[PDB]
Structure 1
Amino acid sequence: QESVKEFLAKAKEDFLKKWETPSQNTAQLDQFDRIKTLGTGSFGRVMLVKHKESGNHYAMKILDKQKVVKLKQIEHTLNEKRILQAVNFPFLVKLEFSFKDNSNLYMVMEYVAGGEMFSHLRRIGRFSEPHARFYAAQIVLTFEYLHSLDLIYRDLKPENLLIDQQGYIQVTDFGFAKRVKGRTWTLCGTPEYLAPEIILSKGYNKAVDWWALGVLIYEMAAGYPPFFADQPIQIYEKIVSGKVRFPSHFSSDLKDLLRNLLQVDLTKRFGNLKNGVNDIKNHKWFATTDWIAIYQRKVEAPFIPKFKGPGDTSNFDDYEEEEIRVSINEKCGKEFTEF
């Protein structure tokens, strides 16, 4: 318990060195080959790429300067990159390279071939409590680290957790990540995962991440989220309402834990109490979990997705291949000066 505190301490120091003095233009477009698109986003897409000098595969994130701009996501894009190049945690996707060009922003990360948890979750339906618990444990720890650096993640969902070769998770998409001492007020996240304080425009803190966990956990063990409907509006209504129904297969410990994460009253919510994280690590639901073991990647994973070979894309869905178009004249230069 003190070992943790001390860990965190050195870790904050490392982060700060990088937070105050970031990396810029460490690669070029040409140094890679575009293999396949792995996902599409709002302002960009993700592609499997291949580094010519080393023959290593990576996932390259590509953001359109112009769309980031019209969508007023400028600050958010700067944050994502600035933060990603500074963290280092076993369950965080590693940023290798970063660069930009006349029309785009690029973030090159390592490739995690197991695909999104979302695909498995959906295909299988739901996970057994022990299975989900395995995952939760990793996110608790990840949040423990992140929150320590005065960071809020803000975009927890199955779509964002990737599964590696060992069956361990990797958190991707820091598009909403923000370093903040104090409150923030941006309306952002994914409907089914938004805390009421966000929805209510109340000004929020890192406690929103904990409500998110609650949702994650419920979703994985039930196979469906606690609050769903066909139009966001309908969802917002159920979130703030305060009602939550659980499946009859939930263990009582589970129901207890989720009843605490899904606390509308920020003043009662687990994780945002004096004792923070400990209120969670100590719960009966996780009585079996050896935090240290998880951290160390010593625990045997419930499911390992088998990799056919390096560069294999079998675990991702297919998307139409647009082609990377690179302008002759620079787009939004001053806006992305620090990238």
Structure 2
Amino acid sequence: HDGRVKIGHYVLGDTLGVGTFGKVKIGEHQLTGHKVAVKILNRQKIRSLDVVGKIKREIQNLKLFRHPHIIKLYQVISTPTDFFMVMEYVSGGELFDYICKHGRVEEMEARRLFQQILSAVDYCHRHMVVHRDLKPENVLLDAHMNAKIADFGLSNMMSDGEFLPNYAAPEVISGRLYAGPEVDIWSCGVILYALLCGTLPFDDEHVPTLFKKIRGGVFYIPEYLNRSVATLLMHMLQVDPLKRATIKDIREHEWFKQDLPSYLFPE
């Protein structure tokens, strides 16, 4: 365009996010104008931290992902200085920004979106070569108001969005040994809570109250929230990882199972 901003059949445009190993830009197919999200991974930075083998395993794994609520990877072009991962672009932006701008979602809508998000999470638990911790900010919305999660491993490029940072599951901030899948449940309870209440369940610019609040596990349940969904939020936000719901427990909860497509949880 103005310069060397074309790669393959694509033209690169504005930066949407920055990550450890590079950045993600909006792109467009040069013949059709169709938008894509191009993660550009800086291979010298990869060599620097000596994670060449892990990056390649992750890219190879992600090439084969196929799930209706995970951003697709269309193509990978590698050059001596970068890998370009041409990915699906989704127009709705990030779920938390949406909620922030429009406030809470109606309950049925919260449940639709929640069932899509947890199916994608479960698929990642099953397929990521290495488990890494879900990042709530990676949950995005497509043009049809459906959830789409952007990959959140080493090549995660998800960077910022709005206003209302210090935030993690109880056992993580207490500096205890922990298991990724259990912390992911807690993070999904924070996502469900924000869809239903239009706020985070622990809010607090004072980073000690916040943390005490988190390990304390005290959260507000608005009057309009029913009790069948209140029990789910409580079992997902259990401070004690050994007491916290698993994905199977969520699957059997009455509020969740309502009107749930089977192809979302095969087995």
The TM-score range, normalised by the shorter chain, is 0.7 to 0.9
Distance 1:140 1:123 in 2: 23
What is the aligned-residue identity percentage?
31
Question: Whole-Å Cα distance in 1 between the matches of residues 219 and 53 of structure 2?
Answer: 35
Q: Which amino acid aligns with 1:49?
A: G
Q: 1:125 to 1:29 in 2, by over 3 A?
A: same
Superposed displacement of residue 234, structure 1: 4.5
Alignment equivalent of 2:116, drawn from 128, 138, 158: 138
Number of aligned pairs?
251
Amino acid at match of 2:133: R
Q: Is the CA contact 1:95–1:110 (under 8 Å) kept in the aligned structure 2?
A: yes
Question: Any conservation in 1 of the 2:228–2:255 contact (CA below 8 Å)?
Answer: yes
Q: Does 1:278 align with 2:248?
A: yes
Cα distance in 2, alignment partners of residues 253 and 111 from structure 1: 35
**Shift in Å, 1:136:** 0.8
Q: 1:66, CA displacement in angstroms?
A: 5.1
* Paired AA for residue 170 in structure 2: P
C-alpha deviation, 1:154, in angstroms = 1.5
**Residues 178-217 of structure 1 aligned to structure 2 (within 5 Å):** 191-192=166-167, 194-205=168-179, 206-217=181-192
Match of 2:96 among 118, 122, 129: 118
Which protein has greater RCO, CA pairs closer than 8 Å, 6+ apart? 1
Evaluate the alpha carbon distance shift between residue 37 and residue 129 of structure 1 in structure 2; reply closer, same or farther with a 3 A threshold: same
Contact between 2:135 and 2:152, CA under 8 Å: does it hold in 1? Answer: no
**Alignment match, 1:274:** none
Distance 1:70 1:232, change over 3 A: farther
Write the letter of the residue equivalent to 1:197. E
Please list every run of 5 or more consecutive structure 1 residues that lacks an aligned counterpart in the other structure.
Answer: 1-27, 178-189, 272-276, 296-339
Q: Which amino acid aligns with 1:35?
A: G
Equivalent position SS for 1:109: strand
**C-alpha contact 1:155 1:176 (8 A) present in aligned 2:** no
Q: Secondary structure at the match of 2:63?
A: helix
Name the CA shift for 1:55/1:245 in 2 (closer, same or farther; >3 Å). Answer: closer
1:239 aligns with 2:217: no
Partner of 1:219: 194
Matches of 2:154 and 2:45, distance apart in 1: 16
Question: Deviations for 1:271-300, whole angstroms, at most 9, x for unmatched residues?
Answer: 0xxxxx3321221222422233778xxxxx
In structure 2, the partner of 1:323 is: none
Contact 1:270 1:279 in 2 (8 A): yes
Residue 244 of structure 1: SS of its match in structure 2? coil
Pair 1:95–1:250, CA change in 2 (3 A): same
* Aligned-pair CA distance for 1:46: 2.1
**CA shift for structure 1 position 70:** 6.8
Pair 1:62-2:40 in alignment:
yes
Instruction: Please give the TM-score of this superposition, normalised by the length of structure 1.
Output: 0.64
Query: Which residue of structure 1 lines up, in the alignment, with residue 69 of structure 2?
Result: 91
Q: 225-234 or 121-130, which moves further after superposition?
A: 225-234
**Displacement of 1:264 after TM fit?**
1.6
Matched, 1:251 2:244: no
Is the 8 Å Cα contact of residues 76 and 175 (structure 1) preserved in structure 2? Answer: no
**2-structure distance, mates of 1:232, 1:41:** 24
1:33: Cα distance to partner? Answer: 0.9
Inter-CA distance 86–234: structure 2 relative to 1 (3 Å threshold) = farther
Evaluate the alpha carbon distance shift between residue 251 and residue 232 of structure 1 in structure 2; reply closer, same or farther with a 3 A threshold.
same
What amino acid does structure 1 have at the position aligned with 2:174?
L
Residues of 2 paired with 1:223 and 1:75: CA distance? 41
Change (3 A) 1:31 1:228: same
* Cα distance in 2 for residues equivalent to 1:171 and 1:122: 18
Contact kept, 8 Å, 1:154 with 1:176, in 2: the verdict is no
1:264 and 2:243 matched: no
- Corresponding letter in the other structure for 2:143: Q
2:115–2:260: 8 Å Cα contact kept in structure 1?
no
User: Any stretches of 5+ residues in structure 2 without a counterpart?
Assistant: 1-5, 156-164
Structure 1 residue 148: deviation in Å? 2.7
Q: Secondary structure at the match of 1:286?
A: helix
**Contact preservation (8 Å) 2:103, 2:198:** yes
Instruction: Give me the TM-score of the superposition, normalised by structure 2.
Output: 0.79
Question: Quick check: 1:228 aligned with 2:203?
Answer: yes
Counterpart amino acid of residue 37 in structure 1: T
